[PDB]
Amino acid sequence: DAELKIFVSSQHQPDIWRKALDQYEAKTPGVKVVIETGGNTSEMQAQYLNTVMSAKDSSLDVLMLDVIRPAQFATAGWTSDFSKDLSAYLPTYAEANTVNGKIVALPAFADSMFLYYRKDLLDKYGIKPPTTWDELKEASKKVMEGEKNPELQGLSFQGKAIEGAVCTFLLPYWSEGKSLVENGKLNFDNKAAVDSLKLWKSFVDDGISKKNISEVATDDTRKEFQAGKVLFAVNWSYAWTHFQGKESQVNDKVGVARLPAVKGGEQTTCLGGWEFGVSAYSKQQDEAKKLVEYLSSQDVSKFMAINAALLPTYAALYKDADVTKTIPWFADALPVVETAKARPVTPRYNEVSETIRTTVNGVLAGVMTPEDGAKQMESRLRRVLRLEHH
Secondary structure (H helix, E strand, O other): OEEEEEEOOOOOOHHHHHHHHHHHHHHOOOEEEEEEOOOOOHHHHHHHHHHHHHOOOOOOOEEEEEOOOHHHHHHOOOEOOOOOOOOOOOHHHHHHOEEOOEEOOEEEEEEEOEEEEEHHHHHHHOOOOOOEHHHHHHHHHHHHHHHOOOOOEEEEOOOOOOHHHHHHHHHHHHHOOOOOEEOOEEOOOHHHHHHHHHHHHHHHHHOOOOOOHHHOOHHHHHHHHHOOOEEEEEEOOOHHHHHOOOOOOOOOOEEEEOOOEOOOOOOOOEEEEEEEEEEOOOOOHHHHHHHHHHHOOHHHHHHHHHHHOOEOOOHHHHHOHHHHHHOHHHHHOHHHHHHOEOOOOOOOHHHHHHHHHHHHHHHHOOOOOHHHHHHHHHHHHHHHOOOOOO
16 A cells, blocks of 8 residues: 655644545545644744755655745755646636746645624624725724623734734735835835834724734634634635634624725735645655645535635636535635735745744834834845846
8 A cells, every 4th residue: 555645734624634535545546645734834834844855855745835835846846847737727826836837736725815704793883894904993993892892802813923924914015006026026115014014013002903913823813703702804714614613603793805905005815825746755756646636626626615615726616506505705705816916936935934924023012113124124025035147
């Protein structure tokens, strides 16, 4: 029996990972798949994979990689190219998994940030979902003033020094119609960067967000909203199944909307999602490729959507009656994914992540001013997102 080892994107829901791989094994005699986990956050996984891949570790066959990894993994030679038409998938994901024309990995699932909201609380007060951060602050004040609930947070977002905080930083910067990369080099708008960091701080200063939002990771936001302690929550699509699941206080109480804009700006969101890479160092190239073909297939995409609310990589699945029955808001989510904005495509993404996320966190922790943060950020990004000779 061949034993394939897949490094997966989450420790959570082990029974659903296993369920999916048990299906492969049943179809595929002579083949077992085991699960290896690291962190539950993309940069803790990156530290882990950097180490094993740097050592040419042959242990891992298939790697689940965040949509920001392909540039590093292709240039470092850590994946085996699919030698392959990505036209079955959303083009934004075909583009993400193509690097200098090499197919680096097959799309696993789509993701973007949405505004989760307690529609029970919005309906009670007759509030429409906010389309700008200013409307979100006015909505928060109105709901929290009437509830007189000391545990009710207006807005949960990710201020912990995690990959997610890179997403946090870029939301307002993108909304103001700015871009971080123009003609292969850093294009940095300081006013727009200062204003992003200023906006996230003002939520804390106003008491719309809790004093320790610099301690809040992706799954913190999810748990606190699930526990019924949050009005408005920036998060990804996976959180929907937890909120409608067995250990939740918000079953039937959750609406989903596009993220608000900065007043006068665009309702932009962060492109997320994950792909399946075959390790360059795998002793089992062909079996690993066959697993990835399966896990990347329309059936598994559909499985991911119905079982864990992971947004499909196949357009037709946003109009699938079973999918739309289970997650009605998926019926309208394709335009959000297909216009979601990409974090920089760069082999040195890890240094880009480190600079942005530690600035967001330090500003939210009161270690540095928005102004200082932007200057520090701009300085390190100039060295990291430079032009190379060849």
